[PDB]
Design a protein around this ligand. Sequence first.
Ligand SMILES: Cc1cc2nc3c(=O)[nH]c(=O)nc-3n(C[C@H](O)[C@H](O)[C@H](O)COP(=O)(O)O)c2cc1C
Ligand SMILES: Cc1cc2nc3c(=O)[nH]c(=O)nc-3n(C[C@H](O)[C@H](O)[C@H](O)COP(=O)(O)O)c2cc1C
Ligand SMILES: COc1ccc2cc(CCc3c(C(=O)O)[nH]c(=O)[nH]c3=O)ccc2c1
Ligand SMILES: COc1ccc2cc(CCc3c(C(=O)O)[nH]c(=O)[nH]c3=O)ccc2c1
Lengths: 313, 313
Amino acid sequence: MCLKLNLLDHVFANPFMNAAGVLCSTEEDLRCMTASSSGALVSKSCTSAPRDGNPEPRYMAFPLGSINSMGLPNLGFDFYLKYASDLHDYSKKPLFLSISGLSVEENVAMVRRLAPVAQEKGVLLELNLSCPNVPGKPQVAYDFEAMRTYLQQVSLAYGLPFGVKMPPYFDIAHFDTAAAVLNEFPLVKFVTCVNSVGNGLVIDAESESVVIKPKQGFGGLGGKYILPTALANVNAFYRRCPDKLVFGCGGVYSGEDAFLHILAGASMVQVGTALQEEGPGIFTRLEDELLEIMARKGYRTLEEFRGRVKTIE
Amino acid sequence: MCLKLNLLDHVFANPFMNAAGVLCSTEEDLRCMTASSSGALVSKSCTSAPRDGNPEPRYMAFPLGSINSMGLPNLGFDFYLKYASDLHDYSKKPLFLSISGLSVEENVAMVRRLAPVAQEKGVLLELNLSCPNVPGKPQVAYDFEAMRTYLQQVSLAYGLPFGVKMPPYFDIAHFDTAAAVLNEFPLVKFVTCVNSVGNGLVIDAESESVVIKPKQGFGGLGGKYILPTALANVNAFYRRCPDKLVFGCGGVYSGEDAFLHILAGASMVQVGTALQEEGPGIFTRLEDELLEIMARKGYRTLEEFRGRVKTIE
Ligand SMILES: Cc1cc2nc3c(=O)[nH]c(=O)nc-3n(C[C@H](O)[C@H](O)[C@H](O)COP(=O)(O)O)c2cc1C
Ligand SMILES: Cc1cc2nc3c(=O)[nH]c(=O)nc-3n(C[C@H](O)[C@H](O)[C@H](O)COP(=O)(O)O)c2cc1C
Ligand SMILES: COc1ccc2cc(CCc3c(C(=O)O)[nH]c(=O)[nH]c3=O)ccc2c1
Ligand SMILES: COc1ccc2cc(CCc3c(C(=O)O)[nH]c(=O)[nH]c3=O)ccc2c1
């Protein structure tokens, strides 16, 4: 009985990894994620220039999840590139580097530079589409013509297999259109579903106040609030993108949540809010929990049940 | 101390009502909602002709909320019109009727007939903008040109104050666009935020199966999962629609939850999943709990704190 997986020409001890933005911003964070029992890690989504992010408080968590408007605080691309080229120990586990440029040109400039390092060291790109573009326009993955533009230009500039981080969708016509766009791009080999559920609003009853400072309290939702949304997106893309891998992300706090993701079609399983709250110890628990469910069901590997969620009739 | 309020030229004993679809499909349901302590009731969204809806199981609830793909089962418009016209006791509480035609034409034909009953009896219209498919087209409220058309035609055909039931949005640009459309229509006097969060997917770990039969298990989410989404949408529209009321819907299980909706800007507060689960007794508890929070804070009226959620700096 086994959590091992081989994909994208890499070997992973188990399907677990951090979600981008969690425990991955500094060299200390990345070392800590590397020392954990996760199967992989991903760096914080980066921009060409270092960024302070939004004013604090900008993240808060509660029994059912989290809200954040971090504003892409990060040490800049040069730092994550150097971590990938010189500091990361690939004998420990694979590394994804997440990029989140504020325009298509900024993305192109980073990918062009990442390419030789990806070719030589095997760092894997995750391009964050659930990201701001021109203000007053929707985020890139909610604007299918911008999304197409970004993927064309990044495919050209990068020329190597990569994946994409997708916001959740809520409408079948959107699942359909989005997957069709992704399916135009053979180099997109994995699709990560989902980013935070956008612009929720948490209000503290005692203080009668929003709980984060940026954007009048509006921010992305993670955690228990979003598991069914996350599972729906995983399975929607799993079903529509048969030549691509899907990575699941949203609401994983237990091996059972991981099991559901995987049933939905997830290959890798990312952990955000629950990891921010519990710390990297969470990975041994998730592994032990998932292996317990497998034992009880008689499953020996992840492929025996990945994507095998049953429907009724 | 009492929770009485006046709006749209009607008096309401308190701000609570059912959410469209819940406990409101049959004469029996409507009579039950009338006998409750609710402040108002709304009928099941109707079509011109009766519908059986989707195959069962089509609704399921869990500790954090519910999923449904009912498929608009209803008795048909003639029945709700007759209820509004001959059966409802307006001395007990106001009635809203929800209409959800599958095209603009169907909507126009229903509202023309409702208009004289609205004039004569005071039944209020809630137009459901939240319907989905025809593979390749988004639900009307996610297609702003269709939405504008529906509201143009309905305002022309109906000619009296009405309200609209909105799905959640997730992106600030969409809030700005959606609100700007709604503000083109002076007869749109209330906006109900929000409908179920679209196309989530609940999977049972034990059976490895989805839990509702229609649409491969995909369906709209209600309950605790959606409270912060619902709060954001209420507040976003309350900010953007200063000449309209906003009615809150989503994740109300307690007086506290209702308090947060009203802080966010809600005038009326609709109860869906929690009402389905607990039954109509829920209304006495919610009134008590909301009055209790008020007394503790020294608030005498809903007006004193409606829309007064605090932001940070
Ligand atoms: C504090 C915080 C920072 C995040 N930053 C990023 C980021 O830089 N890039 C990204 O693609 N997603 C980011 N996310 C989204 C997470 O990667 C994940 O998609 C989301 O939190 C849902 O997973 P969860 O429910 O396990 O939290 C962040 C989330 C949190 C809570
Ligand atoms: C069984 C069921 C049926 C519903 N039917 C309708 C409907 O006919 N029209 C409508 O506008 N909303 C309908 N909804 C959505 C609710 O009115 C409400 O917007 C949603 O459930 C979110 O509120 P809640 O969190 O309190 O469940 C229905 C919800 C459920 C759970
Ligand atoms: C209001 O100023 C803002 C707010 C949010 C922003 C979000 C991003 C994308 C990075 C990201 C973040 C983040 O860094 O805030 N949080 C998430 O939940 N998912 C993400 O993909 C990037 C820039 C952002 C700028
Ligand atoms: C054929 O499959 C479907 C599935 C869902 C449909 C939903 C509507 C709108 C009625 C409605 C329903 C419903 O009746 O399923 N449920 C909600 O949560 N909100 C709604 O507004 C209308 C038609 C629907 C048809």
